[PDB]
Amino acid sequence: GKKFDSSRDRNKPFKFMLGKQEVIRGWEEGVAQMSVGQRAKLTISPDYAYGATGHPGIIPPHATLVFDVELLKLE
C-alpha cells in the first residue's frame, strides 16, 4: 500500500513513552507485546488508529494502517 511516513527515510530513529497515551492504541498494545530486536508488522484497525475523522492530508477516514516496526532498544 501507500507509504505515508517512514523513520528510515529520516535516518533518525523514533522515540516515545509507552503506556502514557502518547501514541495510537494500535501501537500502545502492538509494541507492548514486542521484544527487543524484533521486527513486526502491525495491522491497526481504525478504532485503534485515527477513526472516522482520520488525519486530513495524510490519513483518510476509516483507514486501516500497516506499520513495519523494529524495536531497537529501550531507554
Binding site: 511516513d5 486530513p56 495524510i58
Partner: protein
C-alpha cells in the same frame, strides 16, 4: 525567573494537543506565534542565550516550514516543522 525552556515545553505540549488532538491548526498557530516573536526579540539572560544557541536555528527553521505550509497547504511541510519541534522538546524535557 520564568525560563525560556519552561515556556517552550508548555507551548509545544499545548500546540501538539491542539493539532493532533483537536485538529485545530489555527489555534496551534495562536500559541506558537508569540513564542517565535519572543526569540525574535533576542535573549537577555545567560539561560536565554544558552537556550537560543541550542535550539534557536531549529525553532527558526520550524517556523519557516509552518510558513511554507500556509502557502502550499501541504501537510507535509507542517509535519517537517513538527519534526524539528519534537527534536527540541525531547532535549528540554
Amino acid at each position: 525567573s520564568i525560563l525560556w525552556h519552561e515556556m517552550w515545553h508548555e507551548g509545544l505540549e499545548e500546540a501538539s494537543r491542539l493539532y493532533f488532538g483537536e485538529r485545530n491548526v489555527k489555534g496551534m498557530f495562536e500559541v506558537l506565534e508569540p513564542l517565535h516573536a519572543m526569540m525574535e526579540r533576542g535573549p537577555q539572560t545567560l539561560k536565554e542565550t544558552s537556550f537560543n544557541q541550542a535550539y534557536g536555528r531549529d525553532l527558526m527553521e520550524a517556523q519557516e516550514w509552518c510558513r511554507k505550509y500556509m502557502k502550499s497547504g501541504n501537510v507535509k511541510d507542517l509535519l517537517q516543522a513538527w519534526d524539528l519541534y519534537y527534536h527540541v522538546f525531547r532535549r528540554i524535557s
